[PDB]
C-alpha cells in the first residue's frame, strides 16, 4: 500500500508530460525530473513470465524506484539490475525480505539496510 | 470480421499480411507487429533470438508512433538518437522484405533464401549501429546482409 | 470514412496537440526571458546582405520574412537552406556570439514589437559593427520565441478543434455502424 | 445513399452542389472537382476550352492535399511555391462564384451571365499568374474578369 | 448517444464528481464549473443569486486563463487586479468545500449545512474583496463564512 501510493501519483504525473519527452530538448528540472522518475516506474513494472513474485520482493524492487535510486541509472539496463538485484536480496538478504514481510510495512530499520544495499550493489553494478 | 476472427484461437503461429505494408513494395508484407508464434521465448528459440526479435519490433512499434508526429511537426525536431530509430527502421522494415523464387515474375529479382543465424545477426548488426551509413536501399528487396553491403557499392556508381 | 480510419487519424493529432502545447510552453520561457534581456539591448543599440533568424523553424514566418528582404552571409541555418553560422537560436545570442560573427568579416532582422507582431577609427568601426550585429540578435530571438509561441498556440488549438470534430464524426459512424449491422440481422431474419 | 447513387449514371453532365462549400459563401455551391460532363473533350469542347478545365481542377486538386497541413500549421510552414498554388487556387475558387438574377435578394449583388469565350479567358488569366497582386476578395461574386479588376480598383 | 440523450431531455441539473478536483482535497469533489442548473436563471432563483454564481464562475474561468502565465512568468509579474483574482479564486475554490455531516466518524471533524443565503453571502463578501486579508487556508473545509473568520483567528 505504501509504495504502490507513491508510483500511482509518479506515473500519473509522469503520463501528464510523457508526450514531452520525445520533444522535450529545453524542459525545466522539474519536467525533466517527472520524466526520468517515470521512464523508470515504468521499467520496473516490466516482469518475465512464469515467475510471480513474494509480495516483499515486489516492495523491495519498487522502493529502488521509488526513493531515486535508479534515477540516474540508464533506462535500458533497468531490467538487468533488477534481476540481479533481487537475486541478491534472496539469496545475501533473507531476513530483511522477511521483516518487510512480518512488519506489515517498511520500518527505520529496513528502510536504512536498503538504503545501504542498494546504494553499495548500484554503484557495484555500474562499476 | 468473424472468419478471420474465429481463426486465430486455432493456429500457434500466425502470419498476418498487409495491404498497407505491400502498397509499400515490401513483400513479403508482413506485418511485423501483428504475427504471432508460441514458440516465440526465449527457452525455446533461445535468448539471442528472442531479443534480436523484441529488439527489431520494439524500435517498429517506436517508429510507428513517431511517423504521424514528425509527418506534421518535421524531422528537424526530433533529438539525434530519436532520428538514429528512424533511420534504423527504416533500414529493418526493408531488409524485412526479401525476394521469393516463386516471385521472379513479379520482382524481377532472382529468389533469395537466408539461413535463420543470418537472419539474426543481420538484424543483430543493424540494431547496433553496424550500418548507420548504408543508404536505406540498399536493405530493400535482398538476401543475406552482406547483399545489402554489396548493393550500397552497386548504388554508389 | 471508416471507425479504424478515424481512430488513427485521432490517435496522432492528440499527440501533435500535446506538443504543439509544450512548444508552446517552452517558447514562452524563452521569450520571457529573452522580453526581460531585450531592454538594456536597444538603448544599447543606438551607439553586403546580412541575414539574421536561426536554425530552427516552427515559428511561422520569421525566416521567409527575412528571405524576402533578402532578394551575402546568413546567420541561422535556415537562411542558408532557403537561399554561414549554425546552432543560432536554441541558446540565448550573447555579445560573444556577435564577436565571432564580427571576426570572420545592409543587416536583416526581425524587430519585436508585442507577442503577435514583428517587422522585418579602424578600432571603432570594429565595435560599432560588433554592436549592430548583437542587436539584430537580441531582437532576432525576442521576435522568434514570441512567434513560435503563437505558431505553436495556434496549432495546438486548431488540433484541438479537429480532435473534436473527428469525434463527432467517429460516433455518428459508430452509431451508423450497430444499427447497419442490426437491420441486416432483423432483414435477414424476417424473411424467414 | 442508393438514391443519388444510382442517379449518376443517367446523367449526361452532373451538378453536384456541396453545403460546405455554400457555408463558405461560394454560390452557386458546387463542387469542382465532383461535377463531370460527358463532352469534356478537346475534339468536342476544343483544346484550349479543356486545358483550362483541367488546368483548373488540377490546381484545386493540389490545394485540397495541402489543406490537412494547412488546417493544423497554417499558411507559413508552406514553401513559397505551395503558397502560390494556394493563393491561385483560393482566386480560383471564388472567381468560379456568380451572382445569379433569381438570387439577387440574398446576394446583395445584380445576376451576372458569362459568355463562354470570356470564363476561359478568365480562368486562363488567373492560372497563368497575371493576377496574383490582386487580393482573394476582387474575384468573389463577380461576373467577367474585368468586373474583378474592377473590384480590385475600387477596394484599392 | 441515444441512452444518455433520451435521459438528458429530462435532466434540470447535473452534480459532475472529478477526481482531479479530489486530488486537491477539495471534498465534495464537485467541479464548479463543470456542473450546471437549468434554474441558475434571475428568473427563478433571484438577481443576487444569479449575479453572485455568475461572478464565482468567471473569476474561477479567469484564474484558469492565468495559470499558463504563473507556470511561466511567476505570481509577482502579474497586474495588481490579476494578483487580487488569483487571491480571491484560490480562498473560493476552498470556501466551495465542506465538512459533511455523515463523515464526522471517520474525520473527526463537525458537519456543516449551510443555509443558502448564508452560501450566498459568504461567495459574495469574497468577490467583494472583504476578506483579502485572511490567509488563504482558513477557507478551506469551513461551513458558514464566520468560521472562515473564526478559523483565521485560530490560525495564530
Redesign the interface.
Known amino acids: 500500500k505504501q509504495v504502490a501510493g507513491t508510483m500511482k501519483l509518479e506515473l500519473a504525473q509522469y503520463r501528464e508530460v510523457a508526450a514531452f519527452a520525445q520533444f522535450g530538448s529545453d524542459l525545466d528540472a522539474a519536467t525533466q525530473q517527472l520524466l526520468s522518475r517515470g521512464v523508470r516506474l515504468t521499467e520496473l513494472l516490466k516482469q518475465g513470465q512464469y515467475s510471480p513474485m513474494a509480495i516483499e520482493e515486489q516492495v523491495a524492487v519498487i522502493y529502488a524506484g521509488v526513493r531515486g535510486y535508479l534515477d540516474k541509472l540508464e533506462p535500458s539496463k533497468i531490467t538487468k539490475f533488477e534481476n540481479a538485484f533481487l537475486s541478491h536480496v534472496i539469496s545475501q538478504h533473507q531476513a530483511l525480505l522477511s521483516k518487510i514481510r512480518t512488519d506489515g510495512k517498511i520500518s527505520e530499520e529496513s528502510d536504512a539496510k536498503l538504503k545501504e544495499i542498494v546504494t553499495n550493489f548500484l554503484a557495484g553494478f555500474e562499476a | 470480421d468473424p472468419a478471420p476472427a474465429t481463426t486465430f484461437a486455432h493456429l500457434d503461429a500466425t502470419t498476418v499480411l498487409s495491404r498497407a505494408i505491400a502498397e509499400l513494395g515490401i513483400y513479403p508484407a508482413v506485418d511485423p507487429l501483428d504475427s504471432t508464434s508460441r514458440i516465440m521465448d526465449p527457452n525455446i528459440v533461445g535468448s539471442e533470438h528472442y531479443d534480436v526479435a523484441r529488439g527489431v519490433q520494439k524500435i517498429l512499434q517506436d517508429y510507428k508512433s513517431?511517423?504521424?508526429?514528425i509527418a506534421?511537426?518535421?524531422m528537424?525536431?526530433?533529438?539525434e538518437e530519436?532520428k538514429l530509430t528512424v533511420s534504423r527502421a527504416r533500414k529493418i522494415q526493408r531488409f524485412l522484405s526479401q525476394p521469393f523464387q516463386v516471385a521472379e515474375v513479379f520482382t524481377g529479382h532472382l529468389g533469395k533464401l537466408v539461413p535463420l543465424k543470418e537472419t539474426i545477426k543481420g538484424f543483430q548488426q543493424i540494431l547496433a549501429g553496424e550500418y548507420d551509413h548504408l543508404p536505406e536501399q540498399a536493405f530493400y528487396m535482398v538476401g543475406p546482409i552482406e547483399e545489402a553491403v554489396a548493393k550500397a557499392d552497386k548504388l554508389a556508381e | 470514412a471508416t471507425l479504424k480510419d478515424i481512430t488513427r487519424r485521432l490517435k496522432s493529432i492528440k499527440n501533435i496537440q500535446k506538443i504543439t502545447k509544450s512548444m508552446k510552453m517552452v517558447a514562452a520561457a524563452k521569450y520571457a526571458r529573452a522580453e526581460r534581456e531585450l531592454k538594456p539591448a536597444r538603448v544599447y543599440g543606438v551607439g553586403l546582405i546580412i541575414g539574421v533568424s536561426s536554425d530552427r523553424g516552427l515559428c511561422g514566418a520569421i525566416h521567409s520574412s527575412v528571405a524576402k528582404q533578402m532578394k551575402i552571409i546568413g546567420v541561422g541555418d535556415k537562411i542558408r537552406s532557403i537561399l554561414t553560422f549554425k546552432e543560432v537560436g536554441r541558446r540565448p545570442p550573447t555579445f560573444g556570439d556577435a564577436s565571432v560573427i564580427a571576426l570572420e568579416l545592409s543587416i536583416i532582422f526581425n524587430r519585436f514589437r508585442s507577442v503577435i507582431s514583428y517587422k522585418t577609427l579602424r578600432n571603432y568601426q570594429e565595435y560599432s559593427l560588433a554592436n549592430i550585429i548583437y542587436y539584430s540578435l537580441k531582437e532576432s530571438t525576442t521576435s522568434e520565441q514570441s512567434a513560435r509561441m503563437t505558431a505553436m498556440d495556434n496549432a495546438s488549438k486548431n488540433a484541438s478543434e479537429m480532435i473534436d470534430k473527428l469525434t463527432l464524426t467517429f460516433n455518428r459512424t459508430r452509431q451508423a455502424v450497430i444499427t447497419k449491422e442490426l437491420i441486416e440481422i432483423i432483414s435477414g431474419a424476417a424473411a424467414l
Not at chain 2, 513517431?66 to 508526429?69: K, P, S
Not at chain 2, 528537424?76 to 533529438?79: C, G, K, M, N, P
Open positions: 513517431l511517423q504521424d508526429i506534421i511537426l518535421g528537424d525536431e526530433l533529438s530519436d
